[PDB]
Amino acid sequence: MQAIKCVVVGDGAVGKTCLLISYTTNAFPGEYIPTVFDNYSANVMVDGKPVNLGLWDTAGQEDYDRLRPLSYPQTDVFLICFSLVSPASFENVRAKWYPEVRHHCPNTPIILVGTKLDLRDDKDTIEKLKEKKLTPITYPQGLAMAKEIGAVKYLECSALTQRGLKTVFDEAIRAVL
Amino acid sequence: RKKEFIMAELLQTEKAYVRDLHECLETYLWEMTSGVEEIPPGILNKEHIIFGNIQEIYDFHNNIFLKELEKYEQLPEDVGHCFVTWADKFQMYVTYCKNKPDSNQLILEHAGTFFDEIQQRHGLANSISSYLIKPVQRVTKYQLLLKELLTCCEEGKGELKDGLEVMLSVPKKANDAMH
Numbered sequence: 578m579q580a581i582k583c584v585v586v587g588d589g590a591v592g593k594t595c596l597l598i599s600y601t602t603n604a605f606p607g608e609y610i611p612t613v614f615d616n617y618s619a620n621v622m623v624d625g626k627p628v629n630l631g632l633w634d635t636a637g638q639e640d641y642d643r644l645r646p647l648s649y650p651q652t653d654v655f656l657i658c659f660s661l662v663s664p665a666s667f668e669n670v671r672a673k674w675y676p677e678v679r680h681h682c683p684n685t686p687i688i689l690v691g692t693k694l695d696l697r698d699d700k701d702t703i704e705k706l707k708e709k710k711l712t713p714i715t716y717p718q719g720l721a722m723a724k725e726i727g728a729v730k731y732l733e734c735s736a737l738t739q740r741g742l743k744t745v746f747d748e749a750i751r752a753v754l
Numbered sequence: 755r756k757k758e759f760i761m762a763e764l765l766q767t768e769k770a771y772v773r774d775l776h777e778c779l780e781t782y783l784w785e786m787t788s789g790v791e792e793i794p795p796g797i798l799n800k801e802h803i804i805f806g807n808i809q810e811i812y813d814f815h816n817n818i819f820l821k822e823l824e825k826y827e828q829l830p831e832d833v834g835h836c837f838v839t840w841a842d843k844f845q846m847y848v849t850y851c852k853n854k855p856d857s858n859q860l861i862l863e864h865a866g867t868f869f870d871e872i873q874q875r876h877g878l879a880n881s882i883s884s885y886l887i888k889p890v891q892r893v894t895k896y897q898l899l900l901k902e903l904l905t906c907c908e909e910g911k912g913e914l915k916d917g918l919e920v921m922l923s924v925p926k927k928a929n930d931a932m933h
């Protein structure tokens with residue numbers, strides 16, 4: 578039964594940990610966002626094929642450029658994440674995540690994931706960005722980033738609402754089969 | 755409320771880390787050192803490279819750090835001092851991190867499916883590689899928990915800043931030690 582190592586990378590502002598928790602519990606954690614998501618595996622069926630999906634978080638390693646790649650070898654698929662309401666996290670896909678992921682894993686597939694989709698229509702978020710001469714990242718911007726980095730898919734999701742979330746990991750699995 | 759959730763997570767995750775290391779030592783390690791199974795000549799007597807100092811890391815957590823973290827359960831705002839008291843012990847993560855690339859290449863190039871067979875036999879969800887990343891994960895995680903406590907503990911929170919200092923310095927020092 579095919580085993581899949583999926584590593585989740587990106588800035589602290591993507592909410593990597595919450596993404597994973599929301600995915601694996603089927604719920605935004607709400608009351609308290611845990612800081613720890615331990616390496617995880619579960620069976621999922623995809624296009625009729627059962628698959629053992631492995632998920633590794635990397636939160637905490639954002640400042641340790643030599644430690645991060647300790648997790649990269651033998652990964653089957655990466656999620657390179659950014660928050661749709663942090664332009665700096667989006668830019669770091671280009672500046673930081675893609676280069677190291679590719680350097681260490683040249684032939685491994687990348688899914689480009691925009692998180693925090695629910696905060697992109699939110700007045701308070703939007704106004705906070707307007708005050709810094711910025712806007713949320715929109716759909717064509719992620720598409721153009723995906724293309725620039727060789728990402729097999731660009732996908733947007735919210736862990737709050739679950740919108741697009743299960744699709745993220747479906748598609749990480751389809752990128753390997 | 756929030757400082758309590760964080761403290762609870764600290765402790766729960768510490769127990770799981772101790773359990774995880776223990777399982778790694780008693781399954782993947784023990785099968786090499788036992789003399790129960792046939793070792794690939796690629797890795798024979800190379801358990802020091804594979805596992806690095808994970809034994810000594812486990813004994814720190816299992817003999818000292820967990821019991822002391824537990825003593826701070828009702829004192830979340832003081833828990834930074836635990837990291838200061840035991841700062842020297844954390845220097846062993848520096849050694850662990852340095853060895854981790856050599857560990858991983860050895861397992862790839864020379865272990866074949868020794869560890870995979872051992873995983874199936876014991877029915878473990880975690881592969882040897884998943885266990886051996888855990889120390890790297892754990893050591894970069896304490897600083898996230900301390901930062902969380904700082905967002906919700908009062909002026910009596912220099913007993914967190916000093917802890918965090920130490921827990922920012924250890925992973926940076928291990929980071930800076932890498933070839």
Ligand SMILES: COCc1cccc(NC(=O)Nc2cc(C)on2)c1
Binds near residue numbers: 593596692734
């Ligand atoms: C008015 O909105 C309040 C509010 C408060 C806290 C969280 C959210 N939304 C998310 O966290 N969305 C996420 C989180 C991750 C990770 O991905 N999508 C929204």
